Amino acid sequence: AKKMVEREEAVVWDILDEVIREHPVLLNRAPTLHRLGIQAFEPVLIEGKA
Amino acid sequence: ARVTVQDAVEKIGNRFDLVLVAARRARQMQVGGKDPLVPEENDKTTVIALREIEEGLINNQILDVRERQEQQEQEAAEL
Amino acid sequence: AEIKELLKLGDLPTSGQIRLYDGRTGEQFERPVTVGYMYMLKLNHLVDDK
Amino acid sequence: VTEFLKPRLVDIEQVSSTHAKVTLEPLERGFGHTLGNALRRILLSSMPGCAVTEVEIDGVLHEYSTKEGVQEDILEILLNLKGLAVRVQGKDEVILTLNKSGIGPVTAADITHDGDVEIVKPQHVICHLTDENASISMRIKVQRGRGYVPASTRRLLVDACYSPVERIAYNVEAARVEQRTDLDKLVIEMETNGTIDPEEAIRRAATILAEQLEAFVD
Amino acid sequence: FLKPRLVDIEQVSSTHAKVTLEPLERGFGHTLGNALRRILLSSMPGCAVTEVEIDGVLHEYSTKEGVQEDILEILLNLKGLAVRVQGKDEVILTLNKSGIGPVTAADITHDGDVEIVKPQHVICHLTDENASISMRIKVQRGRGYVPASTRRPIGRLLVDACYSPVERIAYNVEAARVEQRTDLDKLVIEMETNGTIDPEEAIRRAATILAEQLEAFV
Amino acid sequence: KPLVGTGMERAVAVDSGVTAVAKRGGVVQYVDASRIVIKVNEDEMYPGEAGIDIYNLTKYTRSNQNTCINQMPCVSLGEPVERGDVLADGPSTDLGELALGQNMRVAFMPWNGYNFEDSILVSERVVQEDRFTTIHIQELACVSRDTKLGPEEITADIPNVGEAALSKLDESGIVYIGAEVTGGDILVGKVTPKDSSLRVPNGVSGTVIDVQVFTRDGVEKDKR
Amino acid sequence: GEPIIVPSQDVVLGLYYMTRDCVNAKGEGMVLTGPKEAERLYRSGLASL
Numbered sequence: 024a025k026k027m028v029e030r031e032e033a034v035v036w037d038i039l040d041e042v043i044r045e046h047p048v049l050l051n052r053a054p055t056l057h058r059l060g061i062q063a064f065e066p067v068l069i070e071g072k073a
Numbered sequence: 074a075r076v077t078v079q080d081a082v083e084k085i086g087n088r089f090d091l092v093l094v095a096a097r098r099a100r101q102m103q104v105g106g107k108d109p110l111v112p113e114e115n116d117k118t119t120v121i122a123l124r125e126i127e128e129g130l131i132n133n134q135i136l137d138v139r140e141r142q143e144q145q146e147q148e149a150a151e152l
Numbered sequence: 153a154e155i156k157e158l159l160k161l162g163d164l165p166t167s168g169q170i171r172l173y174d175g176r177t178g179e180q181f182e183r184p185v186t187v188g189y190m191y192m193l194k195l196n197h198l199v200d201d202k
Numbered sequence: 203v204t205e206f207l208k209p210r211l212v213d214i215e216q217v218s219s220t221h222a223k224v225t226l227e228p229l230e231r232g233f234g235h236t237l238g239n240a241l242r243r244i245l246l247s248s249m250p251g252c253a254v255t256e257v258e259i260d261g262v263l264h265e266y267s268t269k270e271g272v273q274e275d276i277l278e279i280l281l282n283l284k285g286l287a288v289r290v291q292g293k294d295e296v297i298l299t300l301n302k303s304g305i306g307p308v309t310a311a312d313i314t315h316d317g318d319v320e321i322v323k324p325q326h327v328i329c330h331l332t333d334e335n336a337s338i339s340m341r342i343k344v345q346r347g348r349g350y351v352p353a354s355t356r357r358l359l360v361d362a363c364y365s366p367v368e369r370i371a372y373n374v375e376a377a378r379v380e381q382r383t384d385l386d387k388l389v390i391e392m393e394t395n396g397t398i399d400p401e402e403a404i405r406r407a408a409t410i411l412a413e414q415l416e417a418f419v420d
Numbered sequence: 421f422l423k424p425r426l427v428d429i430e431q432v433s434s435t436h437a438k439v440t441l442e443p444l445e446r447g448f449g450h451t452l453g454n455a456l457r458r459i460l461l462s463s464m465p466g467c468a469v470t471e472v473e474i475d476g477v478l479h480e481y482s483t484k485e486g487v488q489e490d491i492l493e494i495l496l497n498l499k500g501l502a503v504r505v506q507g508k509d510e511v512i513l514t515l516n517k518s519g520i521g522p523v524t525a526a527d528i529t530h531d532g533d534v535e536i537v538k539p540q541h542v543i544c545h546l547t548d549e550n551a552s553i554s555m556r557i558k559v560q561r562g563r564g565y566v567p568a569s570t571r572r573p574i575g576r577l578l579v580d581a582c583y584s585p586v587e588r589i590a591y592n593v594e595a596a597r598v599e600q601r602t603d604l605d606k607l608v609i610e611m612e613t614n615g616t617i618d619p620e621e622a623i624r625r626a627a628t629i630l631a632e633q634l635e636a637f638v
Numbered sequence: 639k640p641l642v643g644t645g646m647e648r649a650v651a652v653d654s655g656v657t658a659v660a661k662r663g664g665v666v667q668y669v670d671a672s673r674i675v676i677k678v679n680e681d682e683m684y685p686g687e688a689g690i691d692i693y694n695l696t697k698y699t700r701s702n703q704n705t706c707i708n709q710m711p712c713v714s715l716g717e718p719v720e721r722g723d724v725l726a727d728g729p730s731t732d733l734g735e736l737a738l739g740q741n742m743r744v745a746f747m748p749w750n751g752y753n754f755e756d757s758i759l760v761s762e763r764v765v766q767e768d769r770f771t772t773i774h775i776q777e778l779a780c781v782s783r784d785t786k787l788g789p790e791e792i793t794a795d796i797p798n799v800g801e802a803a804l805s806k807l808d809e810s811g812i813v814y815i816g817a818e819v820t821g822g823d824i825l826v827g828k829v830t831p832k833d834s835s836l837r838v839p840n841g842v843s844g845t846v847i848d849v850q851v852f853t854r855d856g857v858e859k860d861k862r
Numbered sequence: 863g864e865p866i867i868v869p870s871q872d873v874v875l876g877l878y879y880m881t882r883d884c885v886n887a888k889g890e891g892m893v894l895t896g897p898k899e900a901e902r903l904y905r906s907g908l909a910s911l
Binding site: 176177178 | 235239
Binding site: 203204206208209210212224226230231232233235236237239240243244247248349404405408409411412413414415416417418419420 | 421423424425426445446447448450451452454455458459462463465509561562563623624625627628629630631632633634635636637638
């Protein structure tokens with residue numbers, strides 16, 4: 024499975040689209056003064072670097 | 074995909090308890106071999122548990138009663 | 153005034169704003185917009201190192 | 203080099219009888235808007251249809267003159283009349299009359315059926331008669347055309363809407379085939395009036411656009 | 421209805437021209453124009469270099485004694501070469517100049533199919549009587565912008581491909597002088613090519629791409 | 639060049655050492671992509687052992703912030719060069735004029751919200767023409783030191799590695815200058831007394847431009 | 863107790879430009895059927911925003 028992951032085969036992306044469906048992530052800025060600094064978000068996969 | 078959980082928190086006002094009572098259902102559907110009571114709409118176990126809570130099919134009392142029934146069945150199985 | 157004279161020395165509009173059409177629809181943007189040539193330089197805070 | 207991706211997968215979802223949301227997943231990078239805007243324009247301003255263009259009350263001549271009976275103003279009657287959608291036969295002109303009297307909703311059911319107008323929805327209320335003695339009555343000037351013709355470009359004149367479409371939009375999102383650059387995904391939300399189904403209109407607009415590109419076929 | 425046909429295709433210069441579609445009906449002018457501009461600009465077959473193999477140099481960031489420019493400058497100049505092939509896709513050229521004097525595209529040994537449309541394009545400058553440069557340029561067909569990152573011997577140098585025989589497309593719908601029917605307009609399309617495609621063929625191919633993409637919802 | 643500038647663009651460039659300024663006026667004799675030889679005029683020429691002023695240009699070299707420092711010639715054979723004339727631009731310099739960036743066609747208008755609080759929309763023409771593609775140079779190093787049970791050696795004799803791993807390595811154990819190495823590939827062949835060869839760090843890519851082998855006095859140089 | 867999702871810069875400008883009035887623009891005094899007809903009329907070009 025490790026080798027399959029590093030090879031970045033086409034099947035890996037399809038699997039990743041399944042483990043990402045309803046898995047919230049906690050986006051967080053650096054100076055989180057109030058509680059709204061760290062908020063959950065559902066992931067949408069993009070092709071950029073940001 | 075449940076976007077807002079307001080309909081779910083109608084059942085449990087505390088909200089902290091709502092997470093605790095849905096974790097049990099999610100574990101029962103993930104670890105244990107229990108089929109969901111709602112039509113599985115290609116959603117993960119957590120969203121299925123939340124949706125089940127919304128319809129009024131799963132709460133603390135019903136889940137505890139089901140656990141008691143399972144315990145009674147285990148007692149019958151062990152003679 | 154000197155910049156206006158410079159613009160009039162060519163054929164560009166003296167106001168500095170032209171009628172910029174839109175790519176997708178092909179319709180016209182009302183309220184003509186400013187078009188020009190600004191010196192943009194890329195900072196070295198890239199994203200490949202972040 | 204000549205094998206541009208073609209969107210074979212098309213799904214139609216009918217939210218209502220008159221409202222549909224079609225889609226095309228594969229498409230190509232930069233073809234979503236190119237198709238959507240063209241389709242929107244061609245079926246919004248250049249579609250064949252049939253509607254009404256002018257109606258004449260029995261005596262009321264001014265745009266602001268009033269009649270007894272119906273509480274609806276003559277302007278409101280004209281506003282309600284253009285909403286009515288009629289589909290006719292090869293005849294390019296037909297005159298429909300009305301003479302109904304008595305207290306009650308004057309719907310399209312009482313239209314003096316005459317020749318053939320196929321009132322799409324016969325319970326379309328035009329005016330409301332409130333006095334038994336009074337009698338609201340007119341004669342309609344039904345014709346055929348293409349697009350929206352306001353009264354300004356062209357007796358009580360009212361805007362005529364020949365196009366059988368009501369509201370069409372088009373949105374473009376991002377879809378991926380295997381591993382590839384993001385490919386546009388098209389979604390058209392068409393809402394018709396009742397004479398023709400959304401799919402039929404979207405199928406006629408494409409035919410018209412294809413017929414336009416006939417001299418250039420390689 | 422009226423169906424547009426090409427009537428006049430003038431060539432003011434070798435690069436840019438002006439195509440005219442005379443009998444266009446009202447409304448379809450702009451609809452055809454925007455789509456035929458987007459399709460023309462985005463997807464059009466063209467030929468550009470993909471791999472360059474110098475005789476002595478090893479990598480891109482290395483100078484060469486006898487050439488006034490770095491190898492990077494030579495590659496950048498080679499990227500903008502207007503080459504029109506007639507036949508197979510992959511065709512390999514060969515340049516061989518020895519002597520002081522600016523080398524041009526004419527120095528490239530022409531084959532029976534490849535024909536450089538701009539013989540004055542300067543590649544590099546030799547600044548000695550005892551200097552020689554030899555390259556193997558591989559030219560292949562393509563579509564769009566294909567970078568060198570997504571796409572083995574040490575000698576081979578990879579250059580980004582920019583297959584686009586169109587640079588600037590601008591149309592303008594003018595009111596036609598067709599007297600019998602009014603409201604008719606003509607579509608005048610100006611295209612600034614690089615010298616590889618013919619305006620008539622490019623317009624026809626764009627129209628056919630539109631036609632093929634129209635077959636989805638029809 | 640900056641389309642609109644202040645006027646001090648010809649001072650920061652010349653005053654800094656980024657550009658090679660002529661020390662003696664004359665006529666260019668032999669201009670190449672790496673060297674420029676200028677034959678000075680007779681009046682400037684010193685009486686004995688004089689006549690030519692060789693200028694060596696620094697090609698692609700690492701900077702202190704991992705950028706490229708390249709000096710492109712700007713003169714031609716026959717052009718009369720005078721004292722103080724910049725005959726070779728450096729990094730970010732065009733005809734002896736400070737050029738830190740590029741001038742682009744800018745239109746001020748909101749566009750579907752993609753240019754939000756400070757975001758900027760960039761047409762693909764910018765990327766296609768390689769207007770902002772910058773060169774970055776790094777420098778990985780491998781040190782061989784005397785070790786317990788004998789010193790380490792750089793020989794391409796690494797144990798338990800594939801032929802493909804050693805394909806980049808030369809018979810001596812250094813990667814060819816020109817190979818396009820990526821993450822995980824082998825760069826040197828350091829063998830320690832009983833496989834500690836330097837490898838490309840995960841993520842780093844590119845092509846090798848040059849290789850330096852510093853040796854100590856009293857040790858025989860390797861074949862590479 | 864105030865909303866935390868507040869339109870900040872571009873959307874508010876778009877809505878402000880959308881919901882204004884001009885003393886004399888093309889398509890004045892017309893009796894529009896509904897919002898659908900308003901959208902059709904603006905998109906076609908026979909009237910102004």
